[PDB]
Amino acid sequence: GTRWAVLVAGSNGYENYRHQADVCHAYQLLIKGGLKEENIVVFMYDDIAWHELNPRPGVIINNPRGEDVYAGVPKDYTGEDVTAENLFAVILGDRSKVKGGSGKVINSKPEDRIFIFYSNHGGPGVLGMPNEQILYAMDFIDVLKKKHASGGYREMVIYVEACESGSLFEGIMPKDLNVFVTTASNAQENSWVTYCPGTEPSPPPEYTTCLGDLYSVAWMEDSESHNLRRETVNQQYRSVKERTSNFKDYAMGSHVMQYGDTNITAEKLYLFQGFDPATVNLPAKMEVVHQRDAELLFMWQMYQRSNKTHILKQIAETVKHRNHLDGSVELIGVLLYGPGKGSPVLQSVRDPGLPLVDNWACLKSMVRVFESHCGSLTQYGMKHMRAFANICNSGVSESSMEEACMVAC
Amino acid sequence: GTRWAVLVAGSNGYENYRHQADVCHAYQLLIKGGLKEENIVVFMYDDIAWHELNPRPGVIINNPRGEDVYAGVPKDYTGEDVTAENLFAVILGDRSKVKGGSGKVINSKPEDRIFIFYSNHGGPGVLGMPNEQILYAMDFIDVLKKKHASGGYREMVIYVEACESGSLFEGIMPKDLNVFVTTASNAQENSWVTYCPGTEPSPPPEYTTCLGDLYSVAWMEDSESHNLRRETVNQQYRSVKERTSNFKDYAMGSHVMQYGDTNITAEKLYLFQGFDPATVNLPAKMEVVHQRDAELLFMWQMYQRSNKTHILKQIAETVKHRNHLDGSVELIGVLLYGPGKGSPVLQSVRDPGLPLVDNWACLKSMVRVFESHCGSLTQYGMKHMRAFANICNSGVSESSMEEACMVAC
């Protein structure tokens, strides 16, 4: 059949350079393997290559070797068109449902294979989309079920780089859709950023932002250094799981998880990623930063490279906002469950294999009520999605949530 | 010689009933042992016995057996006269330095023994005094040295019930002053509250506030159930250490610590606490609450006993204030040390045996700068004293602290 791909960077801003660098690197890799541009849909905000802070204008790199990955990348869905609605329409292969962009969709045949790679921010049961948009896991599984029931493909592999990414599939990803999935982390772990300024590796000194994400560069660097007609999906999973665990030091590493149809792990990777004829032969611990910590570290290094007062006030406003969100969520737990009980209810993690939330529509409603009183969650705010899921699961009503949010903000 | 005592409750408000109950119980115990009222100085705000919330007006109890401990307690230093300045003057035995109160002081002779018991709130290197007053550990050790150099006593025993109370003596309490000290906790642990509503024990149901504190009721109930001509200071320390550890479950118990002159542990307790001729014969796990958590639990139970809107708003204002203090301190760490470094610097605990802070005058100055921009610390705020001590120890200047506090608030 035909190999298709959908590559998505869910973030924007120079601070999040790495998410678009990861996506651009994946695009170059797929082209080198023989996938056609018409079958690869790229979602990237596209604010990085020409950003005023970029020391290499018109260039994007994804590791300290400094090879450009931006040239030739198509502008399928960029800027305001990087939405959950467009992503869903693209996967479904329905041009009439897309708003803006190039109109390129995955109008695939039953014999085709599809590869999906997402890189950015996330939280329990959710993924980020640029400018404070939230993509809920069950809406993504719903699209996969719809695409499967319309005979849209033979098999699909999905790689997801985001905090608590295992929570997007645990207890909800069906095994009967011919879809195999791997995530950068389990349901309760953050994901890690690599190639940061001041670290070994050792990135080009002119860079003030991190170049890549740990799980993302593990799979890509593995793919481009092996013959994909010989390497299996399983071999890639194992090598990525080992590299992302960072010598099993989970204080600076994460648990790569797998979901869906594990029979697909026996397949050769070239059926999804293509084969690079140059790689026809062939078969240290990394300093990493927490995804949620990269923004503050970027601003701090910006501050130190002139230590100026505008930057220090920007850091204070960022921390004050995070403290407001953290404090409001904590306070809601107190008002609903009582002191001493609020924290165990909001922070308890369900056993692996169980869905984050029993009612996904209730989860969206709790977020809506919260934001209507306490303000937008923003990408950082996605870390509190398990608290909202736990409020839903506890049987607390939406009227009580309204009252608690009103008292809290 | 003569036995003297100084009993101090460092808090006020009905929520803190237990601190004055502990002190009143200690007073009754000392009288039963033959200590004279003229030699016992009592510091209690005195807002509990006749509080509008008290279900037994004019009565105070310190355990579920319900025996009154208020009747006969002298009003030496009450209300506005419960200050660090008056406490210091009383210990020094200088009537001319006291402001207000009865004028009773420890004008002791070189052959005399003194027993000091403090109960309330605390933080690293500090003790509370009523209405947001802070008593610094080195000022207390300074008074002990002055009293020792003036030949004020033969020996002294001090019992201190407060969070992180071990930090008041670690690395600073001299062993050459004929003073032996025990604390409810080590330098990095909170202290525990007992006889709380809804717990077993099983307090009288009409009570909405906790009756006693764990270390305090351990020593008092031990003293009143033994012959003190036979029991040693060491035997009391061991029994209190065992009871306060709560079956070595330090998630609901603490490490009772000892400082000063350990030769005093060989002495019979009656040399300090007297002997009750009624106790001439003779030789389960407790549900406990964190000292800092008692206030919110009290308000919540007040709320549930009418679940009303005024109480819920009061809970929100309390939590918002604690979140403001926690957030401001965290933000100052970020501004001074950078993200990722702020928290390890502010929260690192020195090895046991080392003083909390190298310069105590700098500690007072950091608190002064902080409160001038971020507002009063309040008793809860004492938990952040290690952060202030760590700023001093790091060599950060007062001008830089001023700048960080200004940006943060």
Side-chain angles (χ1 to χ4, degrees), chain A residues 1-119 121-306 309-409, chain B residues 1-119 121-306 309-409:
Chain A
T2 295
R3 289 163 296 206
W4 300 80
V6 182
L7 312 175
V8 177
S11 66
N12 72 356
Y14 195 74
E15 48 273 22
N16 293 131
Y17 179 113
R18 66 197 181 273
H19 304 316
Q20 293 174 245
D22 288 344
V23 164
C24 291
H25 185 174
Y27 181 77
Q28 301 302 339
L29 186 147
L30 295 169
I31 287 297
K32 283 171 179 96
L35 271 76
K36 301 186 171 54
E37 175 181 342
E38 65 203 18
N39 304 123
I40 306 165
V41 180
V42 179
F43 282 79
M44 58 179 194
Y45 200 88
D46 198 28
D47 60 331
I48 302 302
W50 298 103
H51 198 288
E52 61 179 301
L53 301 179
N54 194 352
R56 293 195 197 175
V59 169
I60 298 180
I61 67 169
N62 193 45
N63 62 62
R65 298 180 293 276
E67 179 178 6
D68 171 55
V69 290
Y70 188 70
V73 174
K75 311 306 187 68
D76 290 316
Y77 298 90
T78 73
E80 64 181 18
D81 302 322
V82 182
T83 63
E85 294 71 21
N86 276 343
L87 176 58
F88 296 161
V90 158
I91 295 165
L92 291 179
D94 188 35
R95 207 194 155 133
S96 80
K97 270 181 170 174
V98 177
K99 198 175 90 167
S102 65
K104 188 194 282 162
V105 299
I106 310 305
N107 49 308
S108 52
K109 290 179 188 163
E111 57 260 36
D112 297 350
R113 284 187 173 88
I114 302 160
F115 171 68
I116 299 175
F117 167 52
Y118 171 98
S119 181
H121 294 288
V126 299
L127 288 182
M129 294 295 271
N131 299 326
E132 305 168 15
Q133 293 177 259
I134 298 176
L135 184 156
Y136 293 83
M138 198 58 105
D139 296 340
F140 184 69
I141 304 304
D142 176 54
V143 171
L144 297 186
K145 284 161 50 165
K146 292 178 170 170
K147 170 87 161 178
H148 178 78
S150 310
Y153 60 97
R154 174 165 176 186
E155 291 179 329
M156 175 185 302
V157 163
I158 307 174
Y159 286 177
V160 179
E161 164 78 80
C163 297
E164 289 111 17
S165 47
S167 73
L168 302 168
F169 306 95
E170 237 159 69
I172 68 172
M173 176 66 193
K175 299 184 174 44
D176 67 338
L177 304 181
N178 306 117
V179 178
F180 171 66
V181 179
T182 76
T183 67
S185 76
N186 67 27
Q188 56 199 113
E189 279 174 332
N190 64 87
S191 75
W192 302 89
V193 177
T194 198
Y195 306 145
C196 322
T199 70
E200 235 93 321
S202 177
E206 68 264 30
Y207 285 92
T208 67
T209 194
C210 309
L211 308 179
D213 301 272
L214 184 59
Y215 163 94
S216 298
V217 308
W219 83 254
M220 292 185 287
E221 295 174 12
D222 177 69
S223 281
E224 66 191 13
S225 72
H226 289 92
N227 182 334
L228 302 183
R229 289 184 75 92
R230 294 174 83 103
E231 195 178 359
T232 61
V233 170
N234 191 53
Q235 278 166 330
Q236 181 143 277
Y237 161 70
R238 300 195 175 184
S239 289
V240 166
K241 169 177 195 319
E242 181 193 355
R243 183 154 177 212
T244 307
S245 74
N246 217 9
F247 286 91
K248 289 169 178 289
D249 181 356
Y250 298 106
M252 56 191 229
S254 62
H255 289 89
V256 169
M257 309 295 283
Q258 70 173 31
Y259 305 92
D261 185 2
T262 62
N263 289 353
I264 298 181
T265 73
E267 303 271 48
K268 302 296 197 183
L269 228 23
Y270 91 106
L271 297 183
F272 298 93
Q273 303 184 359
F275 161 70
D276 187 347
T279 352
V280 82
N281 305 300
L282 293 139
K285 221 166 192 229
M286 315 184 73
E287 301 188 53
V288 288
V289 162
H290 192 132
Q291 297 275 355
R292 297 194 179 103
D293 291 347
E295 189 185 7
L296 290 182
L297 282 176
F298 164 76
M299 303 175 83
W300 183 253
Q301 287 162 20
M302 198 129 290
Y303 167 80
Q304 276 181 324
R305 291 201 209 195
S306 195
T309 278
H310 172 74
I311 308 176
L312 208 56
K313 200 207 146 293
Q314 228 171 276
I315 294 157
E317 294 320 292
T318 300
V319 176
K320 282 178 197 180
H321 185 239
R322 338 239 293 193
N323 287 350
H324 159 76
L325 294 175
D326 286 0
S328 301
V329 167
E330 177 193 319
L331 177 46
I332 290 157
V334 178
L335 304 174
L336 297 176
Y337 306 106
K341 297 280 153 41
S343 166
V345 173
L346 299 189
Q347 305 190 358
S348 289
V349 185
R350 294 179 148 187
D351 300 311
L354 305 184
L356 175 76
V357 71
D358 296 322
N359 185 334
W360 289 84
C362 184
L363 179 58
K364 297 174 181 176
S365 284
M366 292 305 110
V367 173
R368 175 177 47 76
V369 170
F370 179 88
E371 301 186 309
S372 77
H373 295 281
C374 313
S376 187
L377 273 178
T378 83
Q379 289 196 328
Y380 170 77
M382 291 191 287
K383 74 169 284 184
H384 294 302
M385 203 63 56
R386 172 171 281 107
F388 298 128
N390 284 344
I391 289 171
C392 298
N393 296 340
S394 73
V396 154
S397 71
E398 179 170 345
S399 54
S400 284
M401 179 66 172
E402 279 276 9
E403 177 201 319
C405 289
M406 202 158 294
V407 173
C409 306
Chain B
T2 295
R3 289 163 296 206
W4 300 80
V6 182
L7 312 175
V8 177
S11 66
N12 72 356
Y14 195 74
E15 48 273 22
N16 293 131
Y17 179 113
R18 66 197 181 273
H19 304 316
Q20 293 174 245
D22 288 344
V23 164
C24 291
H25 185 174
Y27 181 77
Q28 301 302 339
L29 186 147
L30 295 169
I31 287 297
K32 283 171 179 96
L35 271 76
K36 301 186 171 54
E37 175 181 342
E38 65 203 18
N39 304 123
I40 306 165
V41 180
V42 179
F43 282 79
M44 58 179 194
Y45 200 88
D46 198 28
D47 60 331
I48 302 302
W50 298 103
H51 198 288
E52 61 179 301
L53 301 179
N54 194 352
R56 293 195 197 175
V59 169
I60 298 180
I61 67 169
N62 193 45
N63 62 62
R65 298 180 293 276
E67 179 178 6
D68 171 55
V69 290
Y70 188 70
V73 174
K75 311 306 187 68
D76 290 316
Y77 298 90
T78 73
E80 64 181 18
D81 302 322
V82 182
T83 63
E85 294 71 21
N86 276 343
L87 176 58
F88 296 161
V90 158
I91 295 165
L92 291 179
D94 188 35
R95 207 194 155 133
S96 80
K97 270 181 170 174
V98 177
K99 198 175 90 167
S102 65
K104 188 194 282 162
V105 299
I106 310 305
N107 49 308
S108 52
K109 290 179 188 163
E111 57 260 36
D112 297 350
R113 284 187 173 88
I114 302 160
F115 171 68
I116 299 175
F117 167 52
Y118 171 98
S119 181
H121 294 288
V126 299
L127 288 182
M129 294 295 271
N131 299 326
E132 305 168 15
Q133 293 177 259
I134 298 176
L135 184 156
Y136 293 83
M138 198 58 105
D139 296 340
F140 184 69
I141 304 304
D142 176 54
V143 171
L144 297 186
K145 284 161 50 165
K146 292 178 170 170
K147 170 87 161 178
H148 178 78
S150 310
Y153 60 97
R154 174 165 176 186
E155 291 179 329
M156 175 185 302
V157 163
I158 307 174
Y159 286 177
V160 179
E161 164 78 80
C163 297
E164 289 111 17
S165 47
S167 73
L168 302 168
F169 306 95
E170 237 159 69
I172 68 172
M173 176 66 193
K175 299 184 174 44
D176 67 338
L177 304 181
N178 306 117
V179 178
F180 171 66
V181 179
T182 76
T183 67
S185 76
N186 67 27
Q188 56 199 113
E189 279 174 332
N190 64 87
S191 75
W192 302 89
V193 177
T194 198
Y195 306 145
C196 322
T199 70
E200 235 93 321
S202 177
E206 68 264 30
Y207 285 92
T208 67
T209 194
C210 309
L211 308 179
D213 301 272
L214 184 59
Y215 163 94
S216 298
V217 308
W219 83 254
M220 292 185 287
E221 295 174 12
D222 177 69
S223 281
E224 66 191 13
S225 72
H226 289 92
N227 182 334
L228 302 183
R229 289 184 75 92
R230 294 174 83 103
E231 195 178 359
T232 61
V233 170
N234 191 53
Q235 278 166 330
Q236 181 143 277
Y237 161 70
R238 300 195 175 184
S239 289
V240 166
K241 169 177 195 319
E242 181 193 355
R243 183 154 177 212
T244 307
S245 74
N246 217 9
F247 286 91
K248 289 169 178 289
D249 181 356
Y250 298 106
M252 56 191 229
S254 62
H255 289 89
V256 169
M257 309 295 283
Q258 70 173 31
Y259 305 92
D261 185 2
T262 62
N263 289 353
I264 298 181
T265 73
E267 303 271 48
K268 302 296 197 183
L269 228 23
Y270 91 106
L271 297 183
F272 298 93
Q273 303 184 359
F275 161 70
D276 187 347
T279 352
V280 82
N281 305 300
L282 293 139
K285 221 166 192 229
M286 315 184 73
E287 301 188 53
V288 288
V289 162
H290 192 132
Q291 297 275 355
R292 297 194 179 103
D293 291 347
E295 189 185 7
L296 290 182
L297 282 176
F298 164 76
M299 303 175 83
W300 183 253
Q301 287 162 20
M302 198 129 290
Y303 167 80
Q304 276 181 324
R305 291 201 209 195
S306 195
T309 278
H310 172 74
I311 308 176
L312 208 56
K313 200 207 146 293
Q314 228 171 276
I315 294 157
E317 294 320 292
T318 300
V319 176
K320 282 178 197 180
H321 185 239
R322 338 239 293 193
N323 287 350
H324 159 76
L325 294 175
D326 286 0
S328 301
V329 167
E330 177 193 319
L331 177 46
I332 290 157
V334 178
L335 304 174
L336 297 176
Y337 306 106
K341 297 280 153 41
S343 166
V345 173
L346 299 189
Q347 305 190 358
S348 289
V349 185
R350 294 179 148 187
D351 300 311
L354 305 184
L356 175 76
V357 71
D358 296 322
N359 185 334
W360 289 84
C362 184
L363 179 58
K364 297 174 181 176
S365 284
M366 292 305 110
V367 173
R368 175 177 47 76
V369 170
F370 179 88
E371 301 186 309
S372 77
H373 295 281
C374 313
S376 187
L377 273 178
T378 83
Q379 289 196 328
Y380 170 77
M382 291 191 287
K383 74 169 284 184
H384 294 302
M385 203 63 56
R386 172 171 281 107
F388 298 128
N390 284 344
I391 289 171
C392 298
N393 296 340
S394 73
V396 154
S397 71
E398 179 170 345
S399 54
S400 284
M401 179 66 172
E402 279 276 9
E403 177 201 319
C405 289
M406 202 158 294
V407 173
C409 306

